[PDB]
RNA sequence: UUAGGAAUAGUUAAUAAUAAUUUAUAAUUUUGAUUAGAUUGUUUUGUUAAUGCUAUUAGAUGGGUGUGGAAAAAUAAAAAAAAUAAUUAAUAUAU
């Protein structure tokens, strides 16, 4: 399941979900680290 | 492409510093060129005056491997590997190095280990892969018995 | 199918009356299908259920389907009060994000 | 030409066809009428298509409208079955009133 | 497939990736092709807190009794412009205020120039519709020096957040055709002093020390304490 | 019976010639998107190798009955802007339709006018493009464009391409696949040949120079500050949304 | 506290301190009077924090 | 010990469904027949149902089963049952279709005897 | 009148042959025994039968079945056989000043070439998607279903699995026995008497197709 | 399969026939059909000396949507469902 942290981009919309899937570059970097540790 | 490859290798070996222009004008956009074109052209890139021209030409050759769907061979990446102290062009991905270190350290400590050098029959081989067993276990019976009305 | 024990008698087929969903929708105010003419001034009592009353249903409670012009009714909602905590942003952690915004309504009731 | 080929799997008729032999029983008048009247209706339908286009076009149009707008035009296991009242016989009483019986042949 | 992540590797369903191929996974849905997308929820929703205390008017309502004072009309136009600009700048809002509809200029998204990402679009043609904030834009895409051969449709050209720097030397009139900008490897010779590659294949950016500190504090390696 | 000859697998399908979403209209800029890269490679071929019937002295005179049968799919170049008779001249003035000749006009001969010729029966188009010489590409003396006055000289420089297509067809029809022969250009090798006087003025570099200084280091990598879409290595996005392989990720923010 | 049916923040008084929270297994959470989904959420959050993943997820209530 | 085929069938049922069979399926239930119609006024023209009729294709009494040992298995080596058959032509009223009557054997183990039944097929002759 | 489709010209060319069984010689003879044109009314009629609006396109015979192609080739063979002294004089090395005769000769050459091309289409590509026919002004309901629906995404075509299969009558066409045995006669009738029918590479292919499909 | 046994049909084959304007001395059935009744089947159950008698709960579902590869789609304690959520153990549910 794709994790939605609290510090993602919030979608201020009353017609749908309140949080998007747009990350932070720190989240991108740590996801790359976890990707390498799974790649082994 | 193999006809243009000999021309590119001749212009590299003669040291005329014009094989890259021939590769751009004739072989780059209109041929399915493989990776040994850049294995020839890296020696021509090496003979440049300044190191930054060598670096930018190697990086542009890597972008040419990305764009025209011609992946870099092992020999080209090993040619760029040997000059990493001068050019500092990274030629392996972030995934292959993390696999390589964790594999190489484990294989070195496994070869140095004296306990785990013993064979493992669960791991080393498959004992039998045929759909039928190799010797008769007695079954089937092919006859009925008491209380069995359905035969065959 | 389901495993059913065989009986030598007849089988009872019940059509038993459940709690009507339209009844709890009219009580909770979340019907959105009742066309009611003859707008009156008598007040309306609505028992607030769990996650059954929002702005969408309260707008139809103010303006019903009959073509009203003004919310001319007093609306009593039993147990509809909400309590909000103050929200704040987290400076620490992996990034910047605002938490704390939550409603204490419908779960923490008054007068235990 | 009385024995089929076991190797190639040909029939009794195809082996005699490949040998240039004719094994055909003496037909009656109706059996010759069955084999002689196949071309007559084709020449009649081709002459109708060439001679009356304003009627053949309307007939083909209403035939395509009846074919296209049908309910069971999707190729499925039910539409692909050879015998629908025999394979699906539990629908012939309470659901489908097209076929009144479930047996029409030796199967 | 054409392009799988890490080849065939199926110890987990996350090892394949969030999408199995850059092509669409079914033929009947061509909109499921993998492409770079844009956060349209934050961008397309402009701030309505600038239109408060401002009387807007409908288009059809041209009756005399619904007309407003011309000072109120002017502040309504100023508030509507501030509402349209409040999130970002569109392509059609930047090209209207440029000469020759901005043909030949370089448009770019905000995140197209940060990190090791380098990509812009040299504008070639724009068809404005009657609502001039929308339309269809075309251009040559330039990514790390390499350039397309034909003009491609600029995806998300209607979503705001675009930027350009107007250069008079790049302006192409309506009589002539916008030329493709040259590929730095192919067309013009490669010069390290003019353009230097930020990124290349088999290259990854080094780890920032603040990200290293943040990950080692989140994992518990460094002693994070209040 | 008739039902049991074959199965229903792979039935007869409606062709793309009768579907409007598969047929490219010539009043649209999408007509000039498909056919303009075919022209910029044909002029690269005709400037480097002799193409037999690519340049004539006049328009090919087929009879009026054989006009629709033989002419679509045929291309030839003539000198000057002379248009065939029994056609209605429609000049392409749309900048959305003229933008696809950008590589054709910049790196090769400058495009002056693009005209679409529609006949009286509205069944045989002609895409007329008038170029102004000279070529930016080097032209071989044995090439086909050496026999053209507008291409060799540097009114008299104008020459026109003529391509006949059918009006409402899929873009399979307006293809030029027989002209994709890749003939080489001997312009970098003409310096060192026996026909040039520069053959003794170049100096060969048999060894690389000794490098005392290493390469210039890159500037300090600054990470982005905006919200990113996610990991492009698992969203199946190519390395910039443009080209490359997803398995070899590069050129993104990290 | 993310789920509606996992009221994690309603059991602050069921623990002494940080060590009492991080030493209790699921049987001791059953002893203290915590429902099944809530104690499963508490135990998975503790096991994720021990593995290096802090509880940084979006509250999906509204 | 040599286990019978029922052990192998029970093993197959265990590996398929997780368990062999739920117990208490007999129950010794008194199945009573309650008639509704009049004495000789059953709504059928041939078979008048007045008792508990058993339902089952191969699990009824007296028990039948196919007998695979006949002339066809002695003559033809078949890839599957019913692939090759030998019969007599009885009808040629249809075009390119010969009606062929063939015989097969059905075994009664209670009386220990095989009987010859007849099946008609439509064959093709061009 | 001048037909606008190939099918109307096929019907007219069939009515010409069937309306004059033994009078097929006197119907279409417009020339003498020396090559000079006798009656120009028959010439003007036969020129406007094979009109440019009917047989001008390269795919003009795309909806012609195996039975209509026999009518086309029988009409061409009868026109060649009744006026052989005209054709063998004028088509080889003769230039004529009459503007009607050059138009008739061009129309006849175009009709014979597209008829032989359709014969090679039905022979060398049996049941191919490029050998499929359809009805003229045929109802293709997928287009009318896409037009009278609202497409928010035009790539999503409604009733695609049924609309792509169904059009007004559309068959996979291959040459039968009665078609191939007639076309092998008509293609040999299209040539001259001095030509060798052994080296014709289309009659031999039709005969070998007949033998292969009969075996 | 029916304690009191007779007729059946969107019908059979051929076919240059998708989408049958034609041809035929057509097809099923007393070796038991169609309809009506009972009705998931199944060496898994029980009993016995018993090739006998007696039981059964795997399933499927031509008009709800031509979507989808496949309608099986109006509701099932897991079959963990695209970042290692958790994988020490037992309750795993009431809560
Ligand atoms: Mg007949």
Percentage of residues in helical conformation of chain A: 25-40%
The radius of gyration computed from the alpha-carbon positions of chain A, rounded to a whole number of angstroms, is 13 Å
Number of helices of chain H: 2
Please tally the β strands of chain H and state the result. Answer: 4
Give the ordered list of helices and strands of chain A.
H
Enumerate the distinct ligands.
magnesium ion
The H-and-E topology of chain H, N to C, reads as HEHEEE
| Biggest interface found | E-F, 57 and 50 residues
How does the major sheet of chain A shape up?
A: none
The shape of chain H is flat
Q: Please summarize the sheet with the most strands of chain H.
A: 4 strands, antiparallel
Helical percent range of chain H? 10-25%
Which structural category fits the helices and strands of chain H? alpha+beta
Structural class of chain A: mainly alpha
Q: Tell me, what's the shape of chain A? A: elongated
Strand content of chain H: 25-35%
CA-atom Rg of chain H in angstroms:
23 Å
Could you give the distance between the termini of chain H?
59 Å
Helical stretch tally of chain A: 1
Oligomer state equals: part of a larger assembly
How large a portion of the residues of chain A is in β-strands, by DSSP E?
A: under 5%
Short summary of the structure?
This is part of a larger assembly, with nine protein chains of nine kinds. Helices cover 16% and strands 12% of the residues of chain E.
Itemize the secondary structure elements and their pairings.
This is part of a larger assembly, with nine protein chains of nine kinds.
Chain A: H1 25-39
Chain B: H1 2-13, H2 19-28, H3 36-46, H4 51-67, H5 74-81, H6 94-112, H7 121-124
Chain H: H1 5-17, E1 65-67, H2 71-75, E2 88-94, E3 97-108, E4 113-123
Antiparallel strand pairs in H: 1-3, 2-3, 3-4
The structure holds magnesium ion.
The structure holds one RNA strand of 95 nucleotides.
Question: Could you explain the architecture of this structure?
Answer:
- With 40 residues, chain A is mainly alpha-helical.
- Helix content of chain A is 38%, strand content 0%.
- Chain A has one helix and no strands.
- With 152 residues, chain B is mainly alpha-helical.
- Chain B has helices at residues 2-13, 19-28, 36-46, 51-67, 74-81, 94-112, 121-124.
- Chain E is an alpha+beta fold.
- In chain E, 16% of the residues lie in helices and 12% in strands.
- Chain E has helices at residues 40-44, 70-85, 91-95, 209-219, and strands at residues 106-109, 119-127, 136-143, 146-147, 152-153, 162-164.
- Classes of the chains: A mainly alpha (40), B mainly alpha (152), C alpha+beta (112), D mainly alpha (107), E alpha+beta (226), F alpha+beta (254), G mainly alpha (62), H alpha+beta (126), I mainly alpha (215).
- At the E-F interface, strand 2 and strand 3 of E face helix 1, helix 3 and helix 4 of F.
- Magnesium ion (MG) binds next to loops of chain D.
- Magnesium ion is lined by residues 37-38 of chain D.
- Chain H binds one RNA strand of 95 nucleotides through residues 4-6, 9-10, 13, 16-17, 20-29, 37, 39-40, 42-63, 93-97, 108-110, 112, 116-118, 122.
